[PDB]
A paper describes a structure:
A potential workaround to the size limitation in cryo-EM is to bind a small protein of interest (the “cargo”) to a much larger carrier (the “scaffold”) in order to make it large enough to visualize readily. In the present study, we demonstrate a protein design advance that substantially rigidifies a cryo-EM scaffold based on fusion of a DARPin as the modular binding domain to a designed protein cage. Analogous to antibodies, sequence variations in the nonconserved loop regions of a DARPin protein can be selected in the laboratory in order to obtain a variant that binds nearly any protein of interest. The rigidified scaffold described here provides a number of advantageous properties for cryo-EM structure determination—size, symmetry, and modular binding—making it suitable for future applications to many important systems.
KRAS is a 19-kDa GTPase involved in signal transduction in cell proliferation pathways. KRAS is among the most prevalent human oncogenes, with mutations in KRAS occurring in about 25% of all cancers. Drugs bound to a minor cleft region of the protein near that location are of key pharmaceutical interest, including covalent inhibitors targeting cysteine mutants (i.e., G12C or G13C). We therefore undertook a series of structural studies on known KRAS mutants, focusing on the degree of atomic interpretability in 3D density maps obtained using the cryo-EM scaffold described above; a DARPin with loop sequences that bind the GDP-bound form of KRAS was already known from prior work, enabling the scaffold to be readily repurposed to image GDP-bound KRAS structures. For imaging experiments, we investigated three different sequence variants of KRAS—single site mutants G12V, G12C, and G13C—in their GDP-bound forms. All three KRAS variants were found to bind with good occupancy to our cryo-EM scaffold (presenting the KRAS-specific DARPin). For the G12C mutant, the resolution was 2.2 Å for the entire particle and 3.0 Å around the KRAS protein. The maps and refined KRAS structures were all closely comparable, with significant differences in the maps occurring only at the mutated amino acid side chains, as anticipated. As an assessment of coordinate precision, the rms deviation between the two most closely related cryo-EM structures (the G12V and G12C mutants) was 0.58 Å; this is slightly less than the differences when compared to previously reported X-ray crystal structure, which are between 0.73 and 1.1 Å.
Residue numbers in the entry:
A (entry chain B): 1 to 165
B (entry chain A): 163 to 320
Write the structure that this text describes.
Amino acid sequence: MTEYKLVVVGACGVGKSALTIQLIQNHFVDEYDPTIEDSYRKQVVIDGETCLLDILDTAGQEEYSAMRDQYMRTGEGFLCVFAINNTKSFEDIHHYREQIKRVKDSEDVPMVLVGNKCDLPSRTVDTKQAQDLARSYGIPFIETSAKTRQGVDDAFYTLVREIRK
Amino acid sequence: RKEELDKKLLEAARAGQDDEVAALLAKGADVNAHDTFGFTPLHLAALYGHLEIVEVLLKRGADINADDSYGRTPLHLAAMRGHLEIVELLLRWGADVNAADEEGRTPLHLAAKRGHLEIVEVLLKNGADVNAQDKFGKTAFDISIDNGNEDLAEILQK
Ligand SMILES: Nc1nc2c(ncn2[C@@H]2O[C@H](COP(=O)(O)OP(=O)(O)O)[C@@H](O)[C@H]2O)c(=O)[nH]1
Ligand SMILES: [Mg+2]
């Protein structure tokens, strides 16, 4: 089976670990450890084709990780997750994209903007702003909610499809 | 009352408060308490590099082969983080050197993938399967080949 390497990047607390655990084990975990950075492997069927997704659930970005460097150097796709109830994550998405483009040295990398925590009543990040930024960068935008699993599979499959094309 | 004391012990083990861990253990806290994913206080102490809390928990009677929701033992986390003293102490207390998680990854796999050569050689010295295949048919040598770690490949071969 073809192996696609994905990196779940973003700010701390946005929900990268929750999204990845929701995808691989179909349940929601709260108060997950914010410093453990583990790579998971998930066998999926997309458009009828079977693939293996190796997802780096990024964490501990303050320190240096050789595995994180290797993943970002050879990253086939990125989930630039941000929390809609947190403006700072939406601001740091640009810095993360700049770092990814610098390390990859490529003007076109498969990235997907993800707005987590859609279930929360607060909407401090407007959907219009995220849609406009995604359109400007020409990349899909999916709103997910690891607490209710609304769109986790859709977001990951969209990222895989972006990898394919 | 049980749950709150358990959570306080877990947060003290994670944060690295020897005085708080001692007070909570003397207060009746459960050493086998697990959070939502399953991290016991020994999981968090091995993960965060707190040698003293690891010693206190192992003396008090903390389970050393407990696994979280993904089947990772405290030895798994101590290997993935690169805490040589902690892995040596856990293996001294007879921690499973060939434990398998939900992907069937030996702590050797995590130590090799993260790039910690000293953890890899310590685990090999203490009886770790060099030719161990996970649930996706990969070994430590396969990890070294994929990551291009020449020193890790040399250590595994010899
Ligand atoms: N409602 C809701 N809460 C979330 C979601 N994702 C994460 N959380 C909460 O955020 C807290 C920590 O987020 P976490 O996943 O550890 O952040 P990360 O490790 O930086 O990706 C957890 O206690 C979750 O309850 C989501 O999609 N919806
Ligand atoms: Mg995380």
